[PDB]
Ligand binder design. Structure first.
Ligand SMILES: O=C(O)c1cccc(O)c1O
Ligand SMILES: O=C(O)c1cccc(O)c1O
Ligand SMILES: O=C(O)c1cccc(O)c1O
Ligand SMILES: [Cl-]
Ligand SMILES: [Fe+3]
Length: 175
């Protein structure tokens, strides 16, 4: 029902050159998060969660995000399939998600052992949603990388109340 900031043309979202799927694997913490249905919530700040990418034999990722919610560890699980050029992905078993007609992932940049920026886009009940995650191998990143992520999001038309920085926690996400 509610109006949405439109998705940007893909022409504005870079693709990472020579993507290495082996080195992008393992666990990443979500240290920055923006998108058109992401809202700053000062009363109740978003908490850091993690996303583990596991490379399978068939070259798909099995993908698990671990979050802390209502005193418990939640697990959100899905398969990312290699898309039309390397470092992009489509969603496996799209039909089994009600309302979902379109899903897209594009890794924007990464140095594989410190940080990454990734882009996501879905159509759900004919509404078009998008987000950008700032990832780290630890729960901390520098001012430089964070201002880099604020500039890139703003370049996609997101104002600053649609850009947030999950607070580090120890429950569920560690290992
Ligand atoms: O639906 C979720 O809980 C969720 C968790 C991690 C990452 C996502 O994109 C999600 O939609
Ligand atoms: O956010 C979602 O709706 C979603 C749907 C299907 C698969 C996913 O990984 C998601 O995050
Ligand atoms: O949560 C979201 O806003 C969202 C947006 C685009 C794609 C997703 O998977 C999401 O979870
Ligand atoms: Cl994520
Ligand atoms: Fe999602």
């Amino acid at each position: 029902t509610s109006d949405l900031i439109p998705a940007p043309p893909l022409s504005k979202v870079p693709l990472q050159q020579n993507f290495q799927d082996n080195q992008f694997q393992g666990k990443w913490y979500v240290v920055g998060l923006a998108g058109n249905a992401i809202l700053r919530e000062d009363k109740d700040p978003q908490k850091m969660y993690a996303t583990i990418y596991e490379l399978k034999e068939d070259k798909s990722y099995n993908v698990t995000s671990v979050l802390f919610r209502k005193k418990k560890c939640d697990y959100w699980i899905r398969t990312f399939v290699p898309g039309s050029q390397p470092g992009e992905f489509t969603l496996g078993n799209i039909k089994s998600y009600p309302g979902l007609t379109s899903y897209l992932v594009r890794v924007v940049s990464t140095n594989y052992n410190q940080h990454a920026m990734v882009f996501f886009k879905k159509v759900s009940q004919n509404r078009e949603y998008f987000k950008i995650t700032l990832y780290g191998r630890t729960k901390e990143l520098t001012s430089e990388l964070k201002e880099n992520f604020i500039r890139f999001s703003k370049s996609l038309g997101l104002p600053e109340n649609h850009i947030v920085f999950p607070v580090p926690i120890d429950q569920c996400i560690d290992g």
